[PDB]
Amino acid sequence: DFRDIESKFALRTPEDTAEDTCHLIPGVTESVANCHFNHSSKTFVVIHGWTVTGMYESWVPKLVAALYKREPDSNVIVVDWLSRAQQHYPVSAGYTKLVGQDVAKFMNWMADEFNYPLGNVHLLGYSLGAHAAGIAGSLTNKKVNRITGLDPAGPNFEYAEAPSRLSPDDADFVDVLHTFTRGSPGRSIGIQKPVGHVDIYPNGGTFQPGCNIGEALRVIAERGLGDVDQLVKCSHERSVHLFIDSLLNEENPSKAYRCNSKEAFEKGLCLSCRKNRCNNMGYEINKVRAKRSSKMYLKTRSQMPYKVFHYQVKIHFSGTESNTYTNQAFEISLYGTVAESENIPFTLPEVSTNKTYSFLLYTEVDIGELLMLKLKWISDSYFSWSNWWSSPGFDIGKIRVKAGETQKKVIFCSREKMSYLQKGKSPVIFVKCH
Amino acid sequence: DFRDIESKFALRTPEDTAEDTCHLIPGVTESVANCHFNHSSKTFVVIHGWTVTGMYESWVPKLVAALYKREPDSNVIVVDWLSRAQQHYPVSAGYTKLVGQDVAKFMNWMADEFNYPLGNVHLLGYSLGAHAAGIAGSLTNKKVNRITGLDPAGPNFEYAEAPSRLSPDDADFVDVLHTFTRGSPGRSIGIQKPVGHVDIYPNGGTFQPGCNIGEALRVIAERGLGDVDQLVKCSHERSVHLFIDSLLNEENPSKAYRCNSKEAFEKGLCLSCRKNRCNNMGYEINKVRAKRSSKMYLKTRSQMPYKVFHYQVKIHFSGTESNTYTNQAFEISLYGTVAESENIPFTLPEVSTNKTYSFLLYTEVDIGELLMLKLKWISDSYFSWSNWWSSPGFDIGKIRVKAGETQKKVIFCSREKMSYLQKGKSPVIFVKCH
C-alpha cells in the first residue's frame, strides 16, 4: 500500500541546502539507514506551493539554512510537489487531497515502523502547502504538535470546512501569517477568515512596504517574466521572510499584539496585554489555546530586520478657541537613551477641544527609555504669508504615552506655560514628570 | 515470532570496548536507529563461549579494540551467552541449537527489514561459539561470507554431522585454528577432525610454548581459582591471541604452510607452494576452495609478535667411516643481512653415510638474506677427555637450504678442504656459492 506515492520526500543537510540528495521512500526502510535521521531530535517538514516553473522557489534554501542554524542536529524533510503542481492551478487545489493523504501515509508508516513521537514535527506550510498540511495530520492517528503555515491560499478554500481546508483541530497547535488579504471576500488570494488558534495579520494584510507599483506595462515589464514578477509578489513571500527573520533573531522576537479589529489597532486602544495576549510571533511563539478565533496585529520595517516597536499615545487637548478642524497632519519626534527618531509623521482627523484623542505610532530603531518629545504641527503655507497673522492654535497639558513591550505609563508633562501649540510653528517640548 | 530470543545482541564502539551500551532487539527496529549502524560497511559478530564466571572473558575487549583498529567505521555485534552458558557444560552443548536458531532469526530479520547484504558479515566463533555459528547461518537463506572460528569444541561434536556441528557448507568460506588437540580421539577438548575448507594446526596442536606446567597442586595452586587458571588455559586462548596479533600486524602476515601430516611438516619436505598452497593465516587469509580437507602447519614465537620464519635444510652427508649413529643433537647457526641467530639447536637421529637428510628449522628474528652458516655438533663430554682421541666424524660437501617465504634454492658450499665435521669440535663454516 505504498505504490501510489508519486511524491518523493527529500532530506537535505546543512552542507547541502540546494539539491535534494536523499529519497526517503515510504515503506522501504532502507532509506532511513542510508541517510542519517536522528530519531531523538525534532524534525520539520517543509511543504512548498504552486510554482509556474518546474523547480523549487528561491526561498526554500534560505529557509532550510536558517532552520538548521536555529536547531542543529535536527532532520529536515522536503516534498516534491513538482510533476503535479505545474498543472492548472485548480488541478493543484484538487491534488491537495492526494498530497495530504500521501503525507498522512508517510507519517503513519514512520509512527508504525519507528514509532517516532508525533509531538516533535512541524508541517511548515506555504501557499497551497498550508492547506495541504491542514488536510494532512487530520488523517494521522496521533495528531501533530505544530502545523504553522504561511499565507494560506484563499481561493477554493473559503466557504469550506475542516476536511477540505486547514482547521484548528488539524493539529495540537496552529498559527498562520495572513500577509495579504486585499480584495473582495472569497476572491483575494490570501484567506481572511481566521483559521488557527492564533492568527497574525501584519500591517493589516492590505499590502507590504518592501515593494512598489511593480508591473509598469503588460509587455514592457515582466508580469511573470521573472524580473519584476518577484516585485509583484510583494507580500506572498513576506510571510516566509518574516518567519526566517524571526528564526534567525531568536534573542529579540517581535511582539505582535492582540486586538479586536484592524481599525481598533490603528487607533491604539488595544495594546495592553495583562492576560495571555500579545504573544510572540515566529518559532518562539507561546503555545496557547483560545475559546475562539483570536486576531492580532503589528507593524514591521521594510525587509531586513523587521522587529519594530509600538508606542501608542494619548493627548488631552484642552484649549480656548472652539473651532473644530478635521483632516490635519501631526508630526512628532522622540529622543531616548539609546537612539532617537527625528521626523516621524502621523495623522489625526476630527481634532476638537476639551476632548482626549489617541493614535498608534511605530518606530524602527531601539530607543529604550524616552526623555523628551516633539509635537510640531505641519502646514502647506511654509512661507511668511502665514507666519504672522493669527493662525489656529491649541494648548497642551499632559501626555500619556504607553510603552508597548514594557508597560510603562510614563506621564509626559508640558512646561509651565511654554506650549501654545500653533500651526506652522516650532514644536512643543515635553519631559518626564510626575 | 520474536519473543523467545533470551539472548541480547550488543553493539559496542571504539570509545567503549568494555561495557555493552546498546541492545539491538530483534523485530523492534527502534534499536537500529537508536545506535548508529552503517548499513554500507562490513559488520562482524563475535560469539564467545562457555564461562565458569558470570561475565565475558578477558579477551573480548582486546579483540574488539583490534577489530576497530583494523577496520574502522564497521559495526560490531556481541552476544549474551550469559544466563544460559553458566549452566552445566552439556546443557550449553544442547543450548547451542537454541542460540544458533536465535542468531539465524536475527540475521533473517535484518535481511528482511534492511536487506543488509549477507556477504559482509563474519561469525567469529570461539570455544562453543564456533559450533554455535556453524549450526547458525545454515538456517539463513542467503548464506554467510566468512564463519572464521577459533578452537572449535571437541566434546559432543566429534562423530557428528553438519546440522549438529560446524561444517564447510555452513558458509561460503570457513577457517579454524586448531590450537589444542592433545589427548585421545573424541575426548580432547579441541576437535581434531578437519572441518573447514582450510584448517590451521599451529605447533601441531599438541600444546603451546607460552606457558609452563601450571597447576602445582590441587589445593595449593589455583585450578580454576583464577591466578594459574589462565596458565592452565595455555592454548585455548592462544587462538584468539594469534588472531588479534595477525589483525594488528596486517603488513607482515605469518605464512602458514600446507602439508600432508604433522610428521611430514616436521621433517620439512612439504613447504614449497607453487600451486594454491601455503596461504596466509588470519584476516588477510586468501579465500580459496578445496576439493577436500586441507591440513596446514606452522610455528610461532612465545606470545607477543609471533610471525616466525621457516628455513628447512638438507644435508648431503658423505664421509669415509661407515659406523652408523642414532639420536644425536645437531646445533647450527646462521648470519644474514638484517640480524642473526646464534645458538639455535635441532635434532636428527639415524645419521648415516652416503645418504641425504633433511629437517625443519625455525627462527624468531628477521634475517632477510643469509651469508654464512654454523654446523657445530654437540657432545656430553666437554672436558679434555674426548678432545684428543679419535672421535667419530664425517665430511660435508654442499648444503641446500631453502627459504620459506621466498623460494630461494640457495646452494651453500663447503670450503676447499676445511670441513671434516667432528664431535666436540668447532663448527664448519659455509658461504654462498655456485
Q: Give B220-260 as a DSSP string.
A: TTTSSSSTTHHHHSSSTTHHHHHHHHHHH--SS----EE-S
In single-letter form, the type of residue at position A186 comes to G
Contact A334, A372 (CB under 8 A): yes
**Intra-chain end-to-end CA distance of chain A, in Å:** 74
Chain B residues near residue A35 by CB distance under 8 angstroms: none
Determine the Cα–Cα distance for residues B130 and B118; give it in Å rounded to an integer: 18
Q: Do A39 and B29 touch (CB under 8 A)?
A: no
Among A146, A142, A143, A132, CA closest to A197: A146
Determine the Cα–Cα distance for residues B283 and B355; give it in Å rounded to an integer: 43
B162 annotated to a ligand binding site? yes
Q: Describe the strand order of the beta sheet including A329-336 as a list of residue ranges.
A: A344-347, A329-336, A370-374
State the residue for C-alpha cell 471576500.
A185
Contact A329, A268 (CB under 8 A): no
Contact A269, A310 (CB under 8 A): no
Contact B237, B328 (CB under 8 A): no
B400 annotated to a ligand binding site? no
Residue B151 is a catalytic residue: yes
Among B137, B254, B144, B147, CA closest to B196: B147
Q: What is residue A137's three-state secondary structure? A: coil
Contact B257, B310 (CB under 8 A): yes
Cross-chain CB nearest to B33 (options A30, A34, A37): A37
Closest residue in chain A to residue B115, using alpha carbons only: A30
Cross-chain CB nearest to B32 (options A33, A34, A115): A33
Judged by a CB distance cut-off of 8 A, whether residue B114 touches chain A is yes
- Closest CA–CA distance from residue B31 to any residue of chain A (Å): 9
Residue B164 is a catalytic residue: no
Judged by a CB distance cut-off of 8 A, whether residue B30 touches chain A is yes
Count the Cβ atoms, other than its own, within 10 Å of residue B292: 7
Buried-exposed string B295-311: b where 16+ CB fall within 10 A, e elsewhere: bbbbbbbeeeebbbbbb
Contact B93, B155 (CB under 8 A): yes
The DSSP line for A343-384 is -EEEE--SB-SS-EEEE----SS---SEEEEE--B--S-TTG
- Set of cell numbers at residue B11: 553493539
Contact A144, A172 (CB under 8 A): yes
Contact B419, B395 (CB under 8 A): yes
Contact B200, B176 (CB under 8 A): yes
Beta bridge partners of B432: B412
- Closest CA–CA distance from residue A137 to any residue of chain B (Å): 23
Determine the Cα–Cα distance for residues A430 and B35; give it in Å rounded to an integer: 67
Enter the DSSP assignment of A413.
E
CA distance readout (Å), A349 to A267, A358, B142: 12, 11, 86
* Pairing mode of beta strands B198-202, B149-150: unpaired
Contacts of A116 (CB under 8 A, 6+ apart): A39, A43, A110
**Resolution in angstroms for this experimental structure?**
4.2
Judged by a CB distance cut-off of 8 A, whether residue B33 touches chain A is yes
Among A279, A301, A281, A305, CA closest to A290: A279
Buried-exposed string A141-158: b where 16+ CB fall within 10 A, e elsewhere: eeebbbbbbbbbbbebbe
Contact B117, B42 (CB under 8 A): no
* CA-CA-CA-CA torsion sign (B186, B191, B192, B193): positive
Contact A369, A431 (CB under 8 A): no
Residue list for the binding site of A for Ca(2+)? 162, 165, 167, 170
Judged by a CB distance cut-off of 8 A, whether residue A113 touches chain B is yes
Among A302, A279, A285, A276, CA closest to A365: A302
A122 phi/psi in degrees, rounded to 5: -110, 135
Helices (H) and strands (E) in chain B, counts: 7, 16
CA distance readout (Å), B16 to A359, B65, B248: 67, 9, 19
Judged by a CB distance cut-off of 8 A, whether residue B108 touches chain A is no
Contact A150, A114 (CB under 8 A): no
* CA-CA-CA-CA torsion sign (B193, B196, B201, B206): negative
Determine the Cα–Cα distance for residues B322 and B65; give it in Å rounded to an integer: 61
Judged by a CB distance cut-off of 8 A, whether residue A112 touches chain B is no
Determine the Cα–Cα distance for residues B173 and B166; give it in Å rounded to an integer: 12
Among B107, B160, B159, CA closest to B133: B107
Contacts of A419 (CB under 8 A, 6+ apart): A395, A396, A428
- Set of cell numbers at residue B385: 677427555
Instruction: Locate breaks in chain B with C to N over 2.5 A; list the residue preceding each.
Output: none
Residue B102 is a catalytic residue: no
- Closest CA–CA distance from residue B11 to any residue of chain A (Å): 16
Among B310, B365, B321, B357, CA closest to B340: B365
Chain B residues near residue A113 by CB distance under 8 angstroms: 29
Determine the Cα–Cα distance for residues A102 and A115; give it in Å rounded to an integer: 18
Q: Do A115 and B37 touch (CB under 8 A)?
A: no
Contact B292, B344 (CB under 8 A): no
State the residue for C-alpha cell 501557499.
A127
Count the Cβ atoms, other than its own, within 10 Å of residue A329: 14
State the residue for C-alpha cell 488558534.
A197
CA distance readout (Å), B207 to A426, B214, B278: 112, 13, 22
Determine the Cα–Cα distance for residues A334 and B262; give it in Å rounded to an integer: 104
Determine the Cα–Cα distance for residues B294 and B298; give it in Å rounded to an integer: 14
Contacts of B89 (CB under 8 A, 6+ apart): B50, B155
- Set of cell numbers at residue B267: 621433517
- Set of cell numbers at residue A45: 517538514
Judged by a CB distance cut-off of 8 A, whether residue B350 touches chain A is no
Looking at B252-299, list the stretches that DSSP marks H as alpha helix, in order from N- to C-terminal side.
Answer: 262-267
Cross-chain CB nearest to B37 (options A33, A39, A114): A33
B130 phi/psi in degrees, rounded to 5: -60, -45
Judged by a CB distance cut-off of 8 A, whether residue A30 touches chain B is yes
Q: What is residue A19's three-state secondary structure? A: coil
H or E element, residue B128: helix B127-135
Q: Spot the catalytic one: B236, B245, B294, B341.
A: B236
Determine the Cα–Cα distance for residues B3 and A205; give it in Å rounded to an integer: 59
Determine the Cα–Cα distance for residues B151 and B208; give it in Å rounded to an integer: 13
Judged by a CB distance cut-off of 8 A, whether residue A37 touches chain B is yes
State the residue for C-alpha cell 577459533.
B150
Q: How was this structure determined?
A: cryo-EM
Count the Cβ atoms, other than its own, within 10 Å of residue A279: 21
Count the Cβ atoms, other than its own, within 10 Å of residue A332: 23
- Closest CA–CA distance from residue A10 to any residue of chain B (Å): 18
- Compute chain B's Rg from CA coordinates: 26
Contact B123, B99 (CB under 8 A): no
CA distance readout (Å), B187 to B155, B190, B373: 6, 8, 44
Helices (H) and strands (E) in chain A, counts: 7, 16
Judged by a CB distance cut-off of 8 A, whether residue B115 touches chain A is yes
In single-letter form, the type of residue at position A91 comes to V
Query: What is Dmax (Cα atoms) for chain A?
Result: 88
Cross-chain CB nearest to B30 (options A30, A33, A114): A114
Count the Cβ atoms, other than its own, within 10 Å of residue B170: 27
Contact B178, B190 (CB under 8 A): yes
CA distance readout (Å), A262 to A205, A256, A265, A334, A359: 9, 13, 5, 25, 13
Cross-chain CB nearest to B29 (options A34, A37, A114): A114
Q: Do A32 and B33 touch (CB under 8 A)?
A: yes
Q: Do B33 and A114 touch (CB under 8 A)?
A: yes
Among B350, B359, B346, CA closest to B327: B350
Chain A residues near residue B115 by CB distance under 8 angstroms: 30
Instruction: Give catalytic residue positions of A.
Output: 127, 151, 236
Q: Spot the catalytic one: B7, B48, B92, B151.
A: B151
Judged by a CB distance cut-off of 8 A, whether residue A43 touches chain B is no
CA distance readout (Å), B385 to B156, B323, B325: 59, 21, 20
CA distance readout (Å), B198 to A375, B118, B134, B278: 100, 21, 15, 10
Cross-chain CB nearest to A30 (options B30, B34, B115): B115
- Closest CA–CA distance from residue B80 to any residue of chain A (Å): 25
Q: What is residue B164's three-state secondary structure? A: helix
CA distance readout (Å), B102 to B2, B66, B91, B133, B287: 9, 27, 16, 10, 28
Count the Cβ atoms, other than its own, within 10 Å of residue B317: 17
- Set of cell numbers at residue B299: 610455528
Closest residue in chain A to residue B116, using alpha carbons only: A30
